[PDB]
Design an enzyme around this catalytic site. Sequence first.
Site, short mmCIF file in Angstrom:
data_model
loop_
_atom_site.label_atom_id
_atom_site.label_comp_id
_atom_site.label_asym_id
_atom_site.label_seq_id
_atom_site.Cartn_x
_atom_site.Cartn_y
_atom_site.Cartn_z
N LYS A 76 0.58 -1.21 -0.13
CA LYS A 76 -0.12 0.05 -0.07
C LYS A 76 0.58 1.35 0.03
O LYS A 76 0.23 2.18 -0.45
CB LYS A 76 -1.11 0.12 1.27
CG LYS A 76 -2.28 -0.91 0.78
CD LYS A 76 -3.49 -0.05 1.27
CE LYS A 76 -4.51 -0.69 0.35
NZ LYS A 76 -5.22 -1.81 0.98
N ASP A 119 -8.16 -0.30 8.16
CA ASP A 119 -8.29 -1.55 9.14
C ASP A 119 -6.73 -2.25 8.95
O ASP A 119 -6.67 -3.20 9.47
CB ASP A 119 -9.03 -2.32 8.51
CG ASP A 119 -9.17 -2.68 6.87
OD1 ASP A 119 -10.24 -3.02 6.42
OD2 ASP A 119 -8.12 -2.51 6.30
#
EC number: 4.3.1.15
Lengths: 391, 390
Positions: A76, A119
Amino acid sequence: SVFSLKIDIADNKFFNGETSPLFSQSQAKLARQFHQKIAGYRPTPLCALDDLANLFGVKKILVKDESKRFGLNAFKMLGGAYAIAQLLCEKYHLDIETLSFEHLKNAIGEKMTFATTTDGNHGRGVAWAAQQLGQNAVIYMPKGSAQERVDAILNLGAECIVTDMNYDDTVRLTMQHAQQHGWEVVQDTAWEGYTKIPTWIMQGYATLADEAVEQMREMGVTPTHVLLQAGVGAMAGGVLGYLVDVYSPQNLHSIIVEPDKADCIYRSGVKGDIVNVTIMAGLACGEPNPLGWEILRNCATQFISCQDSVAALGMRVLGNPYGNDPRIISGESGAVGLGVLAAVHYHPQRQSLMEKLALNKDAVVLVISTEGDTDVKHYREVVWEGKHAVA
Amino acid sequence: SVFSLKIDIADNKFFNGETSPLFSQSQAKLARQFHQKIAGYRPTPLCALDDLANLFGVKKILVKDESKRFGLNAFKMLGGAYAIAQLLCEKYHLDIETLSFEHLKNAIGEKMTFATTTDGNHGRGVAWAAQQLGQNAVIYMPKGSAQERVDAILNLGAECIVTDMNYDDTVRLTMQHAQQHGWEVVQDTAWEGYTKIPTWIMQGYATLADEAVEQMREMGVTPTHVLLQAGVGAMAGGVLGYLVDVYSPQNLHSIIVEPDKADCIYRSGVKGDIVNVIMAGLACGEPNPLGWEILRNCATQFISCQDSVAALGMRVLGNPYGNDPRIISGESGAVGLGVLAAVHYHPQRQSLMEKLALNKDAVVLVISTEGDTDVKHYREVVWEGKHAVA
């Protein structure tokens, strides 16, 4: 031995093969040239699982191991860090092609505060980039978030607040606090009045796709298939958008994989427009990413809505490889793509499922392992304890 | 996750510390001298699981990986081949200590036929040795045997007959047929009138313990503990026999591990004498008298455990922690390691570690007796999560 896990495969009826110049080769190469400058950069391994491919009855299975992406244990940062640098360059009047990390880290003046809800991986990438560029990060997490992931964000000097609300309700809290305190929202999803940041994110993600292509050309192979796990569809959009600009959407059998409890893109591919939808950390949705959705609606071949335990199956197959294949540490959301191939193989209706996915003895399948063991407690419960087993 | 798997630990009330000169260092080295002459010989890896040891709260965990034994995927040939070579030498009036294995391969004499009952590896080692020395083998397997194990014996040019009876009954049918046709019974267990072959087998097994000791000395470590999985007790008796001659029985905390469905040695350790009572390789029915003699005397503790303990060990070895080396371990091969993992995650971790005398200074030797001898079962455990904890 032989077992049935819920594998729902739907043809994309709204396929038109329209590519996106917004998410193509040129942007990914610019984004990678930014990543190449970061200390400790190395293309993540593309592992050839020859023996597993032979067992499954395909030619080759190739896994992009994004657990090796710096020390982040996930892909990410490729998007988050790139978007943060672009925001810095826009606001503080600088050029991206000539940025110094030690310059921003040490210098005084106006500090940006980046606010995001995660999350797990996204917020870690945001926290990482904020630390590296001498900025502030306020990361919110929903109820039931793993303490290890909370601790990982804190170890990057970012503020991390665990709420008692779900993901969707936590996002609005981040937004309401951002407009109140003058924070800059950095979400990996788009909505009306917010597309600038998520665009850079998706362009940033495509680095792994550029790396993969380079590595597949090194192997002297052309992929026939690609499986892409999709939460909101930011990664799938960016990566497919690149791959499709390289191989053409007509000559790439692309499959989008989602858990059946939050299969937002799957449900959208059935209706033909945006559908709103606890789950595996990383693949939570709520509502599809419009920028990503535009790519998949146009260029995705098939959508899959699958059982939770398909992801767990993938974790185990990757963590304990067949024959002499290399071993890969893959988290729940990172293994679900590979899990599909394994769930199909052991299915009673193996032959008809392989037929539908156009999988045969010639198939060369690209697989993306999006994360490693980000929650070690959960990872070992799956691989050692046999949590979320088959029967 | 915190979970409770059945780990019944019994202190050996019959411990006396009496060693066995019949199963000592000397015979073991003679057996190893013999094995070193067989084509493809190489000491099997003693893997150090440093990272797993740090997690479990011990100093070191060292795993003897017998999956690498001569391409047979298990340790058993060390015994089987040794006994068969001894018998061949007896028939031909040869001295086994002064000749090569290649010399025995091309040896001239009347053709011998070796008969045995097995549920996996023992028969495979017998079948293997018979092929090498140009002899015959007739292997019998009990009901509910895996097809792959049958095939592995058939792929060695030996006969393999699958019966409709259990292990104990099939043993009788093998003895009956061997008397009928004049074959040589090669079983890895002893009884009244049959101790010569099982002795050689147990002496042959000890080669692995000799290798392990050499490797541990190369490492500069001394084991404080050893876990030994037991079917009939031949391996445990042979290995503990050698180990106890090296380190003394008072200084080696030995733990015998058995599944509760066939915990014959455990039940013998609690009651008193031989008690007649599962995962392939650890099936018992009746304890080995030669083996029981060593364990009764020198074994510190016996363990009767749940079957899922073995499956736990399989997964832990095949997907190692941190940077530890990976090991392929079959159901009966992994149960020793499984115990350590079951203790770690147990709510009564502290008391169980206390009972087993496991601490920060413990150096734990584990034997991985087999690799994935049943590929079907192995992948069901490590991939499908068959025999999961919860």
